[PDB]
Amino acid sequence: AQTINLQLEGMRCAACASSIERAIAKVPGVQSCQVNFALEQAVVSYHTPQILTDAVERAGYHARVLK
Ligand SMILES: [Cu+]
């Protein structure tokens, strides 16, 4: 697969982590997602990084790919 790391903004509580995890899981192609709450980071494996960041932004959070 391919794996990307995202730096997120706007997570304020566990419900935010859940919303983001759900937004990512509704993206066709995604295989796996983990969120680091304190650091506002996600690691996502998928089968379109722009697809992922766009989904997170639609859920109401900022997202950028880390390189
Ligand atoms: Cu929240």
From Swiss-Prot:
A metal cation binds at residues 13, 16. Residues 1-67 are cytoplasmic. It is found in: Cell membrane. Residues 2-64 form the HMA domain. Belongs to the cation transport ATPase (P-type) (TC 3.A.3) family. Type IB subfamily. May play a role in the osmotic adaptation. This is Probable copper-transporting ATPase PacS. It comes from Synechocystis sp. (strain ATCC 27184 / PCC 6803 / Kazusa). The chain holds residues 2 to 71 of 745 of the full protein.
